[PDB]
Design a protein around this nucleic acid. Structure first.
Ligand SMILES: [Zn+2]
Length: 254
DNA sequence: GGCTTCATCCTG
DNA sequence: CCAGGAGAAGCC
């Protein structure tokens, strides 16, 4: 799961328990158990996302930081229910009527206020593609910046320092949308291409965020190797780029 | 810039 | 069943 999925989940967590007094708090990790007593009777004030980083803010200025990597997943349950599963529970934030459970995640930390700025991941993530304040021409500026203008898109679109929230599926769907392979640099695009890329970097993630869980978002190439491209009819192929699987259409990506 | 590595879950 | 496959940091 990447940005869009994490924000959908964060929205579900806030709907479940934002503002509601915690009646129980449980952490699997021994070093976090000390926060159990401290948080009972506090409440989540909001669940912030910074790309794939999920920050659950509490009313006593603590912030639970969690990153699902490839395997973590949140689930909202009615309080006291525990749908059977083989995943290991890692976090329970429980209120009178709704409880949220975080399973499998291994990167979980309790942050004090300073660390919202200094934590290693939070310190180096770039702007969030789902941030409404983030505009195409800002993305365009960033693409052309000295920092990123010479990066191949293959790696750049996975680098959370560039744009937070982008992941593999988004990488392939964005590059296909604008007809580019992974081996290009922002410096060598024409202005039309650059403008198309800057818009797709935002609109595709925002589209997935709005509709993936429900015109609606669909993969055009991701996991479609062997199928005919819906734009040009060519057969979508699967290779490896940036040591991650990569899908693309040889017929209309150049 | 290329691994090498960690981490959990699912499949094949 | 066991191995490989599926986000980010580390060590050159
Ligand atoms: Zn095509």
């Amino acid at each position: 799961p990447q940005g869009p999925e994490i924000r959908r989940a964060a929205d579900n967590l806030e709907a479940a328990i934002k503002g509601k007094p915690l009646t129980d708090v449980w952490f699997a990790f021994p070093q976090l158990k000390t926060y159990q007593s401290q948080l009972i009777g506090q409440h989540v004030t909001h669940v912030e996302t910074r790309g794939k980083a999920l920050l659950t803010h509490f009313s006593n200025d603590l912030t639970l930081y969690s990153h699902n990597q490839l395997y973590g997943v949140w689930r909202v349950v009615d309080t006291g229910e525990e749908p059977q599963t083989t995943r290991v529970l890692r976090v329970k934030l429980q209120t009178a009527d709704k409880t949220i459970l975080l399973y499998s995640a291994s990167d979980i930390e309790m942050l004090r206020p300073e660390q919202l700025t200094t934590h290693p991941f939070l310190q180096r993530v770039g702007p969030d593609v789902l941030d409404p304040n983030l505009t195409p021409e800002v993305v365009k500026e960033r693409l052309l910046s000295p920092r990123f203008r010479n990066r191949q898109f293959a790696g750049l679109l996975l680098d959370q320092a560039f744009l937070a929230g982008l992941g593999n599926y988004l990488r392939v769907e964005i590059l296909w949308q604008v007809g580019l392979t992974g081996n290009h640099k922002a410096k060598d695009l024409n202005a039309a291409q650059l403008d198309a890329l800057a818009h797709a970097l935002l609109e595709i993630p925002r589209f997935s965020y709005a509709t993936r869980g429900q015109a609606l978002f669909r993969f055009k190439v991701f996991h479609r190797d062997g199928e005919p491209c819906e734009r040009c009819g060519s057969i979508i192929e699967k290779t490896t780029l940036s040591s991650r699987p990569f899908y693309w259409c040889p017929g209309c990506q150049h």
